[PDB]
Design a protein around this ligand. Sequence first.
Ligand SMILES: Nc1nc2ccc(NC(=O)Cc3cccc(Cl)c3)cc2[nH]1
Lengths: 250, 58
Amino acid sequence: IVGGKVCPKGECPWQVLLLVNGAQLCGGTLINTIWVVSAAHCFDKIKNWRNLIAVLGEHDLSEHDGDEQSRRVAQVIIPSTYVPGTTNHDIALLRLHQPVVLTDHVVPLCLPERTFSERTLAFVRFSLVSGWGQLLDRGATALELMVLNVPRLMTQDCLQQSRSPNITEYMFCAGYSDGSKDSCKGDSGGPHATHYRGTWYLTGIVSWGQGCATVGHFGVYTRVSQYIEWLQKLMRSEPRPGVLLRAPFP
Amino acid sequence: LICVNENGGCEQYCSDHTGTKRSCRCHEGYSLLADGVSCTPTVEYPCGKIPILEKRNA
Ligand SMILES: Nc1nc2ccc(NC(=O)Cc3cccc(Cl)c3)cc2[nH]1
């Protein structure tokens, strides 16, 4: 995250850290006790699928304070329409091997209904993005979880204001074009969380952008509202052997 | 009332029904109040609420 602030410990309780062989891979969002939403592109280069770990209740990566909860990732589900190395359909649904325990520091973000998300949440201007990604373009990653308030743009306005992948119906733009504030590498997969009448909802996934905080460009987020029914169906399904599952979309 | 305008007055989810009808609904871990629009938690850790801030204003 570029130009944000430290998320006070426990105020981003749905944030997930994904690790591979103990190394920082990506962010994610807890949506109930066994299910995490992340970005498909986070898994393009995974060699050992059995060493993926999700950490909940993380805050300061330099210390252990006892609020952290680690779980093996039992399943990574990716839409059939996602092509590795490209930007469209950038979503993954992760099943944990064992549920996390909900606590003051571990709480799921609500996955909204589609209609609610499209008709109401999509018009809330500002939303929060968070992660342990790079604090600057070409810079070091954060040791404390960072958070940033970003405004959403209509895709026609994003394309007009921006000056190379297309912005599809499965994406949206948010952030700033003045190079001050943005998500960045390392934040991929993390939440874009939207507040409405006292409650927070998952509306986007940190996906991509032209560098980070690049003048004339905005951050691009997976439009989660397109995947609600796909996610809901998968969460009712029984696990299959093997970690990676490609599932038909729609 | 219609769900496209003002969320149909619902705090959370809204369904249109045939005629001038509307039903509000709540996420798992919440129940709908008798006003027919408001949602109240039914569990300790409902989704989308931040416990340390909920206690900070409780
Ligand atoms: N401002 C800003 N936020 C970002 C967050 C993440 C990234 N990371 C990538 O762009 C790498 C990437 C490569 C190929 C396909 C995909 Cl979908 C993604 C860049 C970002 N730029």
